[PDB]
């Protein structure tokens, strides 16, 4: 599971997960690019 910025501030954090984990990403204004598993990643637009 890897979450990073969607833009110039990378913040490209990533971790292998082993148990149940409720990771709370503070979703950036440039967007939260996360990939958690072999599916393609979710992008977060922190809208509203």
């Amino acid at each position: 599971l890897s979450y990073r910025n969607m833009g110039e501030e990378p913040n490209y954090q990533e971790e292998w997960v082993t148990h149940k984990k409720e990771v709370i990403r503070t979703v950036p204004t440039e967007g939260l690019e996360v990939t958690w598993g072999n599916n393609e990643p979710y992008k977060y637009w922190p809208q509203l």
Binding site: S2, R4, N5, M6, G7, E8, P10, Y12, E14, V27, E30, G31, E33, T35, Y42, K43, Y44, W45, P46, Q47, L48
Partner: protein, 393 residues
């Protein structure tokens, strides 16, 4: 005419550009870059493979001492173990007493999968500018893919679209790059032939199927096998096997700028950055004369619904009174409001409900329906969910 617009260099936000032509009606168009590829210049110097110590059969001089010759190989290990007592599976390998010498010779060799998998140490050059982008213009949703240096023009749909160059420079290449079988790892390669022991790139392929091997694996010949032909020879491990072990996080996860670093050839697709100045030489047929335009006047834009959200959530029943029927170009003449449609068929004394909204809740925006400038002010709603999928208006 040639309308010069600068789209935001980020895909999916379908920009509208209002081509105003004197002698014609208002000619709004929509453009949006689908993808934009950044193909960097590559200079593949170091090749990554697996080193394998090709050590020969044990040259047992039974009761005899020879002289080891320096075989010119990659790390030719020459060793004369003095006085081996080598015995075989069927007894003694030497019938002589004590003078049996172990000839241990070896070299390095590129692996068979090194012939398949090679780490490509591309020397980074400039990025190729190329991008595919669509536009709902002239009554057609038509796309043009253009090499975006500025001089790869597409006169498509009768329209001379010339886009390029890009404004941005956040290049997905680094100065040195390793292509490792699907992965661009921005890594500095070692000296081409001048590697270190245990380095990522301990076997340096100066050509991809090359004949030279910059390899200093620390293959140290150990002492002989105790009475049996065994090659005592200690070496360092696979430095590309360590580079296989330390595979490293590629730019497919490690993309700063939100770029899509996708290789084969090493490209940067979906590098959302900068602005894109595209000029569109429109023909005369897009210039449709305003005297032949429908006489749309007496508009009242009644703002029915106001939700400042990700969508263009303004609703506006604009009561219009058209002289004749026709697609009046219902473009936004305002600064904040994204209107959903581009043209509306204003037919007569009809109320066209435009779908237009923007980010600002208190939105007083202007809209021109093909000549008709009107104002629409609303107190748009707050957001409902904290997260949307991509950005919005």
């Amino acid at each position: 005419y040639e309308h010069v617009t600068v789209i935001p260099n980020t895909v999916g936000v379908p920009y509208k550009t209002l081509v105003n032509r004197p002698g014609y009606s208002p000619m709004v168009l929509e453009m949006e870059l689908l993808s934009v590829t950044l193909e960097p210049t590559l200079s593949l110097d170091y090749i990554t493979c697996e080193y394998k110590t090709v050590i020969p059969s044990p040259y047992v001089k039974c009761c005899g001492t020879a002289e080891c010759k320096d075989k010119s190989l990659p790390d030719y290990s020459c060793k004369v173990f003095t006085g081996v007592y080598p015995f075989m599976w069927g007894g003694a390998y030497c019938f002589c007493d004590t003078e049996n010498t172990q000839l241990s010779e070896a070299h390095v060799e590129k692996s068979e999968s090194c012939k398949t998998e090679f780490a490509s140490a591309y020397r980074a050059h400039t990025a190729s500018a190329s991008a595919k982008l669509r536009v709902l213009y002239q009554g057609n949703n038509v796309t043009v893919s253009a090499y975006a240096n500025g001089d790869h023009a597409v006169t498509v749909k009768d329209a001379k679209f010339i886009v390029g160059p890009m404004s941005s420079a956040w290049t997905p290449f680094d100065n040195k790059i390793v292509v490792y079988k699907g992965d661009v790892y921005n890594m500095d390669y070692p000296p081409f032939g001048a590697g270190r022991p245990g380095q990522f790139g301990d076997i340096q392929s100066r050509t991809p199927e090359s004949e030279d091997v910059y390899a200093n694996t620390q293959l140290v010949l150990q002492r002989p096998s105790a009475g049996t032909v065994h090659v005592p020879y200690s070496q360092a491990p696979s430095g590309f096997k360590y580079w296989l072990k330390e595979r490293g996080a590629s730019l497919q996860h490690t993309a700063p700028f939100g770029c899509q670093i996708a290789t084969n050839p090493v490209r940067a697709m979906n590098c959302a950055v900068g602005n894109m100045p595209i000029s569109i030489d429109i023909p005369d047929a897009a210039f449709t004369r305003v005297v032949d335009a429908p006489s749309l006047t007496d508009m009242s834009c009644e703002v029915p619904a106001c939700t400042h959200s990700s969508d263009f959530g303004g609703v506006a029943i604009i009561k219009y009174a058209a002289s004749k029927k026709g697609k009046c170009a219902v473009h936004s003449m305002t600064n904040a409001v994204t209107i959903r449609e581009a043209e509306i068929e204003v037919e007569g004394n009809s109320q066209l409900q435009i779908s237009f909204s923007t980010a600002l809740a208190s939105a007083e925006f202007r809209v021109q329906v093909c000549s008709t400038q009107v104002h629409c002010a609303a107190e748009c709603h707050p957001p409902k969910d904290h997260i949307v999928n991509y950005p919005a208006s």
